[model samples]
Target: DELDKIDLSYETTESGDTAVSEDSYDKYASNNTNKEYVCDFTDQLKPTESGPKVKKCEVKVNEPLIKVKIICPLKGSVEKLYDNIEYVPKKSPYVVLTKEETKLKEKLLSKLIYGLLISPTVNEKENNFKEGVIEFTLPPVVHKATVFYFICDNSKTEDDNKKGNRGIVEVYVEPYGNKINGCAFLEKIKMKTFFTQNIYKKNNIYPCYMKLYSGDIGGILFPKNIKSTTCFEEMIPYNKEIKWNKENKSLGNLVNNSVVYNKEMNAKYFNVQYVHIPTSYKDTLNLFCSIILKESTSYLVYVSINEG
Candidate 1:
């Protein structure tokens, strides 16, 4: 005995995002997906007077097919420049850090802080979202910016209900620093954007992927949680005309040089079909989400423009 296999394909859209999210819990629903099944009698076991007996069977299920529609949030970019904080340490009076140097140092410090403390820490026990401070004994005593982000991982669900399934990992930052030198580098600028995906059709729903990133708005650091009424800011995107470099594909160049800076969220949220491989029975996921989020100021940066 034998049967035939069939496949059907459909275009993807943002609505698909919603449909899938809605159906995530309704696993039994008819999906807008392509499927195949077969039967065979050629390979079988025969006994004297008996018909046949099957030795083995194989079954495979591909990703569920669902229509995807991404309602991308307002897409924009922001740019800001910070003034260098010039200072000469008592021990090194012979040389002083330029404003530009100080601005770059501040960016470096923020990146370090985010990298060191944004992962799972004692403070963050759920969804693996950790937040803390990496205070330097010397306090850098420099200008810097703080940023925040959110994470969306659907595959993490059903791994276990003990931890409440780690509801949407959203991270905010503690007040880090202040503005000075007319912002030789834009400091403390934060951009926030929203995105929603919907999938509603009856089809096989495959996994989906989306990402949000923050680098620098102009040369200035964007602040997180700024009032919506505050000035608008934007982030960068690798669009049609723009291509990424394999070796030096950093956020700094992308945010500050290649494109205009949009002081936006450090992490934007979106759904994915399979952001991670399912854990083995009783396996826990020690996942981490963060941004390198680079910011920079060229040597040409000058505060004299403040004379106006």
Candidate 2:
């Protein structure tokens, strides 16, 4: 039940407040800015030769969670300063699943549904590879009794570690398989393709850190999507092979009839970089991502989105 007992908040002294430091803020007088101060507290018990003494009136104030944020206009008109290698696109749209394709597709769809329901694990550490990667096997079809409308399979994460995070699975169904409705497997899960596109242009909005946070409590998970302006100074690319199912959603153990397409960058010190932002998909403005720097430099990054 650790997953069920997650809301661990208790009010002690302050709910919110503002303060002025003479040495920090020089524009105005030190005064309360009327900001809602969140109270932070911890428990204490005095136990000695006095047979486990109990002190009910001992409280302290600590720093509450402060959401760190960064924003900037789409950088433009700046002449290209540094020079680097260019990245080429590798797009191979060959549909190869012939046997049990329908089964495979269903199986993959099931996995995605389970991911939305169970909240697969996500990692969000700077320079941390394998962070926010969703790893899970496919699930079986639900019984007729509880399977309603399929529920859209979209839900929010249920913990502090993933209060504002979500994953976007832009899955495409590949044709061919079983000579009929094909099986289910990831035709292709473009986990963070949008981030890759802009990062490569070096227009800023570098998404160095990417992760999926597994729910620590309630077993409910949320996916946080993020973009970065710092650490991920260069654009990164990726290519993964595709696979299909053999049975009607259960391909057993054989992994074949697939191919992997990889993306390469000109950087010599590193490959694809990553970080985890414990944020939400909708809350795209204030995402905190750590950069995995092969080396350090002093430069700024920016990105602009032209939606479809």
Candidate 3:
């Protein structure tokens, strides 16, 4: 039931939103998640707040769940900056799992279909790693995974104490797994990457086009018989209801003209085809989409545009 509850089948193809529940995170799910840190495969332990002793963890590709521990550090110390390191007071607070936040903990924990794994537990006393602590484990992940443990001290709002803004410990675990060889630019109308900015003197017709050729060739997820749904920055027919097994469609400010999705044609490629008029001052023309294949296998799209 826990696994079924989580929409393992990312049912939508929108971008840039993180509702976690419906197709919200689908807005920008695979697009902006973990900054592609996990996909690129690298050991990362990024701490938003201070005073947390984070041991460098390595959750390798298709390996056993490497178990690691995380105790507390009562005070912040000199950490390396761009130039060097400097000592600072504790920025993270005394984090302890509380009833009010237990719901949050369980909810997030259950969402770890990737490399994050933990059954939740209570830290004990006689530990001098610094202060309070909670230790968890990591599971075997195939592709990429970046999980975060949001531990909070629901007890305090320590802004006045000059320690931290909110008593929260953001323990992020990003492990290096098998690198995903992403798609390639089979074609580009504007001759630019997905995320590019080319400003002009005014508005005109710039047919945004790009043939996304997947790297996973004749493999299980070939592009020959896949479907996609797109979104943009719409007027004409006013379409909303994306019916059962809809073809590659767009939604937003402007879904543009169309996308190239001909049946069985272009053996291994899909297009981000858009030919239309834009703005004068400035228009943020963006196209976010996801191509779906059998067994719910899918890929994503994020093409940006601007005119001046």
Candidate 4:
């Protein structure tokens, strides 16, 4: 078992994010007793059900290794803070409900399954942010992941002029996966900031914010087909700091408060080795690659599988 001597470790930069260097494999290339194998670095930023897996890799002493390089897309985070929307009978000006009005409310309420949905039929505490609002719990290979949330006050939209704020719209994670939901909350004062600060513009009523791993720019990359009416008006970038917490270990001090969000992506080498002792000279080697990726906002994962 020559595989016992291979030591694979996780690499992290001064920035706290992890990444594997391009020359990392050179050290083992000359080891006489150890056979070197090439690992094709591919895009695995998404999550999946079965996780990352390597199908087959065969090693032979006489095989000449080709020095090839593969530069995968730089790793980055994508953050989105969708707003919550609700319907108040008082805001409609008509005391009686039309048939169309009833149907529209029902449709909107049904989509509020994941996050906090506050309406006549919805409660305050339903899916609202609790103590630990982490959306996903990944395996050890995945270093760190979390989401920062901002809640808007909905008390102003009530009929009785009473403060009827909805409960915390917390994100829950399961071994199986994760989910997310929310819409814009409207208040005259809060609404002004969304428009004036250009947080959202051009009559765009949504108040959501997202931060990706944009190092210094504090910018965002909109989808290619993003509609003018349905895009983020401002993709403001902010700082992130990770500190230790006493109560919850999984979520450090960053859980409750709104500090700079410290986001770190772990990078490690997944190695494979095979022994080749064939009776005939016609032996062949085949390779297959697969990886699982996790989304920041939800527990759902996308798996990529490829055969070579």
TM-score of each: 0.15, 0.16, 0.22, 0.14
Mark the 10 consecutive residues where model 1 has the least summed lDDT. Answer: 69-78
**TM-score, model 4 to reference:** 0.14
How accurate locally, in lDDT, is each candidate?
0.19, 0.18, 0.27, 0.19
TM-score order of candidates, best first? 3, 2, 1, 4
Question: Which lDDT value does model 1 have at 136?
Answer: 13
Give candidate 2 regions above 4 Å deviation. Answer: 1-97, 100-197, 201-287, 297-308
Q: Which candidate comes out best when scored by lDDT? A: 3
- Candidate 4 residues lying further than 4 Å off, grouped into runs, are 1-142, 145-147, 172-308
The model with the greatest TM-score is 3
Model 4 lDDT tens row, 46-87? 222322111111112222211211111111211211122121
| lDDT score at residue 122, model 4, on the 0-100 scale | 11
Model 1, CA-based lDDT: 0.19
Error of 1 at 101 (Å): 43
RMSD of 2: 26.3
Q: Global lDDT for candidate 2? A: 0.18
- The digit string of per-residue lDDT tens for model 3 on 24-71 reads 211111111221211110111223234222222222233323344443
Give a tens-digit lDDT track for model 2, residues 151-244: 0010121222222111111122222111101111101232222122223223444432333222100110111222222222232222322233
Name the 10 consecutive residues with the lowest summed lDDT in model 2. Answer: 87-96
